[PDB]
């Protein structure tokens, strides 16, 4: 999962630290979780 | 929707397609969808 998430992360923007405002949906199904939505966001940047 | 390739259209018995849907398939790096009322929002999962 960890490898694939960053593979999808750079499959759209490249390796040159560009970003895309298109989210990445992911669903973890487990008996140990609620029906929760955790929105991880990219770090805020001031200079390109 | 089968010509598009991805299931994102209302399909059921009776009257379902009750409003003219002007789809525009366009080309970009990765897939999402945007309406003209949820401006800014980027729908990504086709159930939604
Ligand atoms: N067995 C079977 N069912 C089909 C086939 N094609 C469509 N159906 C069924 O027709 C019903 C409605 O499908 P749909 O394409 O949404 O019709 P529609 O054109 O949107 C109805 P309207 O245009 O009036 O709003 C569905 O239940 C679908 O399963 C088919 O080839 N075989
Ligand atoms: Mg219809």
CSV table of N, CA and C and ligand atoms in Angstrom, one decimal:
chain,number,residue,atom,x,y,z
A,1,UNK,N,0.8,-1.2,0.0
A,1,UNK,CA,0.0,0.0,0.0
A,1,UNK,C,0.9,1.3,0.0
A,2,UNK,N,1.9,1.3,0.8
A,2,UNK,CA,2.8,2.4,0.9
A,2,UNK,C,3.5,2.7,-0.4
A,3,UNK,N,4.0,1.6,-1.0
A,3,UNK,CA,4.7,1.7,-2.3
A,3,UNK,C,3.7,2.2,-3.4
A,4,UNK,N,2.5,1.7,-3.4
A,4,UNK,CA,1.6,2.0,-4.5
A,4,UNK,C,1.1,3.5,-4.3
A,5,UNK,N,0.9,3.9,-3.1
A,5,UNK,CA,0.4,5.3,-2.9
A,5,UNK,C,1.4,6.3,-3.5
A,6,UNK,N,2.7,6.1,-3.2
A,6,UNK,CA,3.7,7.1,-3.8
A,6,UNK,C,3.9,6.8,-5.3
A,7,UNK,N,3.7,5.6,-5.8
A,7,UNK,CA,3.7,5.3,-7.2
A,7,UNK,C,2.6,6.1,-7.9
A,8,UNK,N,1.4,6.0,-7.4
A,8,UNK,CA,0.3,6.8,-7.9
A,8,UNK,C,0.6,8.3,-7.7
A,9,UNK,N,1.2,8.7,-6.6
A,9,UNK,CA,1.5,10.1,-6.4
A,9,UNK,C,2.4,10.7,-7.5
A,10,UNK,N,3.5,10.0,-7.8
A,10,UNK,CA,4.4,10.5,-8.9
A,10,UNK,C,4.0,10.1,-10.3
A,11,UNK,N,3.0,9.2,-10.4
A,11,UNK,CA,2.5,8.8,-11.8
A,11,UNK,C,1.8,9.9,-12.4
A,12,UNK,N,1.4,10.9,-11.7
A,12,UNK,CA,0.6,12.0,-12.2
A,12,UNK,C,1.4,13.3,-12.3
A,13,UNK,N,2.3,13.6,-11.4
A,13,UNK,CA,3.0,14.8,-11.3
A,13,UNK,C,4.5,14.7,-11.7
A,14,UNK,N,5.1,13.5,-11.6
A,14,UNK,CA,6.5,13.4,-11.9
A,14,UNK,C,7.3,13.3,-10.6
A,15,UNK,N,8.6,13.4,-10.8
A,15,UNK,CA,9.5,13.4,-9.6
A,15,UNK,C,10.1,14.8,-9.3
A,16,UNK,N,9.5,15.8,-10.0
A,16,UNK,CA,10.0,17.2,-9.9
A,16,UNK,C,9.2,18.0,-8.9
A,17,UNK,N,8.6,17.4,-7.9
A,17,UNK,CA,7.9,18.0,-6.8
A,17,UNK,C,6.7,18.9,-7.2
A,18,UNK,N,6.1,18.6,-8.3
A,18,UNK,CA,4.9,19.3,-8.7
A,18,UNK,C,3.7,18.6,-8.0
A,19,UNK,N,2.6,19.3,-7.9
A,19,UNK,CA,1.4,18.8,-7.2
A,19,UNK,C,0.2,18.8,-8.1
A,20,UNK,N,-0.8,18.1,-7.7
A,20,UNK,CA,-2.1,17.9,-8.5
A,20,UNK,C,-3.2,18.0,-7.5
A,21,UNK,N,-4.2,18.9,-7.8
A,21,UNK,CA,-5.3,19.0,-6.9
A,21,UNK,C,-6.4,17.9,-7.0
A,22,UNK,N,-6.1,16.8,-7.7
A,22,UNK,CA,-7.0,15.7,-7.9
A,22,UNK,C,-6.7,14.7,-6.8
A,23,UNK,N,-7.7,14.5,-5.9
A,23,UNK,CA,-7.4,13.6,-4.7
A,23,UNK,C,-7.1,12.2,-5.1
A,24,UNK,N,-6.8,11.4,-4.1
A,24,UNK,CA,-6.5,9.9,-4.3
A,24,UNK,C,-7.4,9.3,-3.3
A,25,UNK,N,-8.5,8.6,-3.7
A,25,UNK,CA,-9.4,7.9,-2.8
A,25,UNK,C,-8.8,6.6,-2.4
A,26,UNK,N,-9.0,6.2,-1.2
A,26,UNK,CA,-8.5,4.9,-0.7
A,26,UNK,C,-9.5,4.5,0.4
A,27,UNK,N,-9.8,3.2,0.4
A,27,UNK,CA,-10.8,2.6,1.4
A,27,UNK,C,-10.1,1.4,2.1
A,28,UNK,N,-10.0,1.6,3.4
A,28,UNK,CA,-9.6,0.5,4.2
A,28,UNK,C,-10.8,-0.2,4.9
A,29,UNK,N,-11.1,-1.4,4.6
A,29,UNK,CA,-12.2,-2.1,5.1
A,29,UNK,C,-11.6,-3.0,6.3
A,30,UNK,N,-12.2,-2.9,7.5
A,30,UNK,CA,-11.7,-3.6,8.6
A,30,UNK,C,-12.8,-3.7,9.7
A,31,UNK,N,-12.9,-4.7,10.5
A,31,UNK,CA,-13.8,-4.7,11.6
A,31,UNK,C,-13.3,-3.8,12.7
A,32,UNK,N,-12.2,-3.1,12.6
A,32,UNK,CA,-11.6,-2.3,13.7
A,32,UNK,C,-11.7,-0.8,13.4
A,33,UNK,N,-12.5,-0.4,12.4
A,33,UNK,CA,-12.6,1.0,12.0
A,33,UNK,C,-14.1,1.4,12.0
A,34,UNK,N,-14.3,2.7,12.1
A,34,UNK,CA,-15.6,3.3,11.9
A,34,UNK,C,-15.8,3.6,10.4
A,35,UNK,N,-16.9,4.3,10.1
A,35,UNK,CA,-17.0,4.9,8.8
A,35,UNK,C,-16.5,6.3,8.7
A,36,UNK,N,-15.2,6.4,8.8
A,36,UNK,CA,-14.5,7.7,8.9
A,36,UNK,C,-13.8,8.1,7.6
A,37,UNK,N,-13.7,9.4,7.5
A,37,UNK,CA,-13.0,10.1,6.3
A,37,UNK,C,-11.9,10.9,6.9
A,38,UNK,N,-10.6,10.4,6.6
A,38,UNK,CA,-9.4,11.0,7.0
A,38,UNK,C,-8.8,11.7,5.7
A,39,UNK,N,-8.7,13.0,5.7
A,39,UNK,CA,-8.3,13.7,4.5
A,39,UNK,C,-6.8,14.2,4.8
A,40,UNK,N,-5.9,13.4,4.4
A,40,UNK,CA,-4.5,13.9,4.4
A,40,UNK,C,-4.3,14.9,3.3
A,41,UNK,N,-3.5,15.9,3.6
A,41,UNK,CA,-3.3,17.0,2.7
A,41,UNK,C,-1.8,17.3,2.5
A,42,UNK,N,-1.4,17.8,1.3
A,42,UNK,CA,0.0,18.2,1.1
A,42,UNK,C,0.4,19.3,2.0
A,43,UNK,N,1.7,19.3,2.3
A,43,UNK,CA,2.2,20.4,3.1
A,43,UNK,C,2.1,21.8,2.4
A,44,UNK,N,1.9,22.8,3.1
A,44,UNK,CA,1.8,24.2,2.6
A,44,UNK,C,3.2,24.7,2.2
A,45,UNK,N,3.3,25.4,1.1
A,45,UNK,CA,4.5,25.9,0.5
A,45,UNK,C,4.3,27.3,0.1
A,46,UNK,N,5.4,28.1,0.2
A,46,UNK,CA,5.3,29.5,-0.1
A,46,UNK,C,6.2,29.9,-1.3
A,47,UNK,N,7.3,29.2,-1.6
A,47,UNK,CA,8.1,29.5,-2.7
A,47,UNK,C,8.1,28.3,-3.6
A,48,UNK,N,8.0,28.4,-4.9
A,48,UNK,CA,7.9,27.2,-5.8
A,48,UNK,C,9.3,26.6,-6.0
B,1,UNK,N,-22.7,4.7,-21.2
B,1,UNK,CA,-21.7,4.5,-20.1
B,1,UNK,C,-20.8,3.4,-20.6
B,2,UNK,N,-21.3,2.3,-21.3
B,2,UNK,CA,-20.4,1.3,-21.7
B,2,UNK,C,-19.5,1.8,-22.8
B,3,UNK,N,-19.9,2.7,-23.6
B,3,UNK,CA,-19.0,3.3,-24.6
B,3,UNK,C,-18.0,4.2,-23.9
B,4,UNK,N,-18.3,4.9,-22.9
B,4,UNK,CA,-17.4,5.6,-22.1
B,4,UNK,C,-16.3,4.7,-21.5
B,5,UNK,N,-16.8,3.6,-20.9
B,5,UNK,CA,-15.9,2.6,-20.3
B,5,UNK,C,-16.1,2.5,-18.8
B,6,UNK,N,-16.7,3.5,-18.2
B,6,UNK,CA,-16.7,3.6,-16.7
B,6,UNK,C,-18.2,3.9,-16.3
B,7,UNK,N,-18.6,3.2,-15.2
B,7,UNK,CA,-20.0,3.3,-14.8
B,7,UNK,C,-20.3,4.5,-13.9
B,8,UNK,N,-20.9,5.5,-14.5
B,8,UNK,CA,-21.2,6.7,-13.7
B,8,UNK,C,-22.5,7.4,-14.2
B,9,UNK,N,-23.4,6.5,-14.6
B,9,UNK,CA,-24.7,7.1,-15.1
B,9,UNK,C,-25.9,6.4,-14.4
B,10,UNK,N,-27.0,7.1,-14.2
B,10,UNK,CA,-28.2,6.5,-13.6
B,10,UNK,C,-28.8,5.5,-14.5
B,11,UNK,N,-29.0,4.3,-14.0
B,11,UNK,CA,-29.6,3.2,-14.8
B,11,UNK,C,-30.5,2.4,-14.0
B,12,UNK,N,-31.8,2.4,-14.3
B,12,UNK,CA,-32.8,1.6,-13.6
B,12,UNK,C,-34.1,1.5,-14.4
B,13,UNK,N,-35.0,0.7,-13.9
B,13,UNK,CA,-36.3,0.6,-14.6
B,13,UNK,C,-37.1,1.8,-14.3
B,14,UNK,N,-38.1,2.0,-15.3
B,14,UNK,CA,-38.9,3.2,-15.2
B,14,UNK,C,-38.2,4.4,-15.8
B,15,UNK,N,-38.6,5.6,-15.5
B,15,UNK,CA,-38.0,6.8,-16.0
B,15,UNK,C,-36.8,7.1,-15.1
B,16,UNK,N,-35.6,7.2,-15.7
B,16,UNK,CA,-34.4,7.4,-14.9
B,16,UNK,C,-33.7,8.6,-15.5
B,17,UNK,N,-33.3,8.6,-16.7
B,17,UNK,CA,-32.6,9.7,-17.4
B,17,UNK,C,-33.6,10.8,-17.7
B,18,UNK,N,-33.8,11.6,-16.6
B,18,UNK,CA,-34.9,12.6,-16.7
B,18,UNK,C,-34.4,14.0,-16.9
B,19,UNK,N,-33.2,14.2,-17.4
B,19,UNK,CA,-32.6,15.5,-17.6
B,19,UNK,C,-31.5,15.4,-18.6
B,20,UNK,N,-31.4,16.3,-19.6
B,20,UNK,CA,-30.3,16.1,-20.6
B,20,UNK,C,-28.9,16.3,-20.0
B,21,UNK,N,-28.2,15.3,-20.0
B,21,UNK,CA,-26.8,15.3,-19.5
B,21,UNK,C,-25.8,15.6,-20.7
B,22,UNK,N,-25.2,16.7,-20.6
B,22,UNK,CA,-24.2,17.1,-21.6
B,22,UNK,C,-22.8,16.7,-21.0
B,23,UNK,N,-22.4,15.5,-21.4
B,23,UNK,CA,-21.1,15.0,-21.0
B,23,UNK,C,-20.0,15.6,-21.9
B,24,UNK,N,-18.9,15.9,-21.4
B,24,UNK,CA,-17.7,16.3,-22.2
B,24,UNK,C,-16.5,15.4,-21.7
B,25,UNK,N,-16.2,14.4,-22.5
B,25,UNK,CA,-15.0,13.6,-22.2
B,25,UNK,C,-13.8,14.4,-22.8
B,26,UNK,N,-12.8,14.7,-21.9
B,26,UNK,CA,-11.6,15.4,-22.3
B,26,UNK,C,-10.4,14.6,-21.8
B,27,UNK,N,-9.3,15.0,-22.4
B,27,UNK,CA,-8.0,14.3,-22.1
B,27,UNK,C,-7.2,15.1,-21.1
B,28,UNK,N,-6.6,14.3,-20.2
B,28,UNK,CA,-5.7,14.9,-19.1
B,28,UNK,C,-4.9,13.8,-18.6
B,29,UNK,N,-4.0,14.1,-17.6
B,29,UNK,CA,-3.1,13.1,-17.0
B,29,UNK,C,-3.8,12.0,-16.3
B,30,UNK,N,-4.8,12.3,-15.4
B,30,UNK,CA,-5.5,11.3,-14.7
B,30,UNK,C,-7.0,11.7,-14.6
B,31,UNK,N,-7.8,10.7,-14.2
B,31,UNK,CA,-9.2,10.9,-14.4
B,31,UNK,C,-9.9,11.4,-13.1
B,32,UNK,N,-10.9,12.3,-13.4
B,32,UNK,CA,-11.8,12.8,-12.4
B,32,UNK,C,-13.0,13.3,-13.1
B,33,UNK,N,-13.9,14.0,-12.4
B,33,UNK,CA,-15.1,14.6,-13.0
B,33,UNK,C,-15.5,15.9,-12.3
B,34,UNK,N,-16.0,16.9,-13.1
B,34,UNK,CA,-16.4,18.1,-12.5
B,34,UNK,C,-17.7,18.5,-13.1
B,35,UNK,N,-18.7,19.0,-12.3
B,35,UNK,CA,-19.9,19.6,-12.8
B,35,UNK,C,-19.7,21.1,-13.0
B,36,UNK,N,-20.8,21.8,-13.3
B,36,UNK,CA,-20.8,23.2,-13.3
B,36,UNK,C,-21.6,23.9,-12.2
B,37,UNK,N,-21.9,23.1,-11.1
B,37,UNK,CA,-22.5,23.7,-9.9
B,37,UNK,C,-21.6,23.4,-8.7
B,38,UNK,N,-21.0,22.3,-8.6
B,38,UNK,CA,-20.0,22.0,-7.5
B,38,UNK,C,-18.6,22.5,-7.9
B,39,UNK,N,-18.6,23.8,-8.2
B,39,UNK,CA,-17.4,24.5,-8.7
B,39,UNK,C,-16.2,24.3,-7.7
B,40,UNK,N,-15.1,23.9,-8.3
B,40,UNK,CA,-13.9,23.6,-7.5
B,40,UNK,C,-13.8,22.1,-7.0
B,41,UNK,N,-14.9,21.5,-6.7
B,41,UNK,CA,-14.9,20.1,-6.3
B,41,UNK,C,-14.5,19.2,-7.4
B,42,UNK,N,-13.8,18.1,-7.1
B,42,UNK,CA,-13.3,17.2,-8.0
B,42,UNK,C,-13.8,15.8,-7.7
B,43,UNK,N,-15.0,15.4,-8.2
B,43,UNK,CA,-15.6,14.1,-7.9
B,43,UNK,C,-14.7,13.1,-8.5
B,44,UNK,N,-14.4,12.0,-7.8
B,44,UNK,CA,-13.4,11.0,-8.2
B,44,UNK,C,-14.0,9.6,-8.2
B,45,UNK,N,-14.8,9.3,-7.2
B,45,UNK,CA,-15.5,8.0,-7.2
B,45,UNK,C,-16.8,8.0,-7.8
B,46,UNK,N,-17.1,7.1,-8.8
B,46,UNK,CA,-18.2,7.2,-9.7
B,46,UNK,C,-19.5,6.9,-9.0
B,47,UNK,N,-19.5,6.1,-7.9
B,47,UNK,CA,-20.7,6.0,-7.1
B,47,UNK,C,-21.2,7.4,-6.6
B,48,UNK,N,-20.2,8.2,-6.1
B,48,UNK,CA,-20.5,9.6,-5.7
B,48,UNK,C,-21.0,10.4,-6.9
C,1,LIG,N1,-31.3,-8.2,-19.8
C,1,LIG,C1,-30.9,-6.9,-20.3
C,1,LIG,N2,-31.3,-5.7,-19.7
C,1,LIG,C2,-31.0,-4.5,-20.2
C,1,LIG,C3,-30.3,-4.5,-21.3
C,1,LIG,N3,-30.1,-3.2,-21.6
C,1,LIG,C4,-30.7,-2.4,-20.7
C,1,LIG,N4,-31.2,-3.3,-19.8
C,1,LIG,C5,-32.0,-2.8,-18.7
C,1,LIG,O1,-32.9,-1.5,-19.0
C,1,LIG,C6,-33.1,-1.0,-17.8
C,1,LIG,C7,-32.8,0.5,-18.0
C,1,LIG,O2,-31.6,0.7,-18.5
C,1,LIG,P1,-31.2,2.3,-19.0
C,1,LIG,O3,-30.1,2.2,-20.0
C,1,LIG,O4,-30.8,3.1,-17.8
C,1,LIG,O5,-32.6,2.9,-19.7
C,1,LIG,P2,-32.8,4.5,-20.0
C,1,LIG,O6,-32.6,4.7,-21.5
C,1,LIG,O7,-31.8,5.3,-19.2
C,1,LIG,C8,-34.5,5.0,-19.5
C,1,LIG,P3,-34.9,6.7,-20.0
C,1,LIG,O8,-34.0,7.1,-21.2
C,1,LIG,O9,-36.3,6.9,-20.4
C,1,LIG,O10,-34.6,7.6,-18.9
C,1,LIG,C9,-32.0,-1.5,-16.9
C,1,LIG,O11,-32.7,-2.3,-15.9
C,1,LIG,C10,-31.1,-2.4,-17.8
C,1,LIG,O12,-30.6,-3.6,-17.0
C,1,LIG,C11,-29.9,-5.6,-22.0
C,1,LIG,O13,-29.3,-5.6,-23.0
C,1,LIG,N5,-30.2,-6.8,-21.4
C,2,LIG,MG1,-32.6,7.0,-19.7
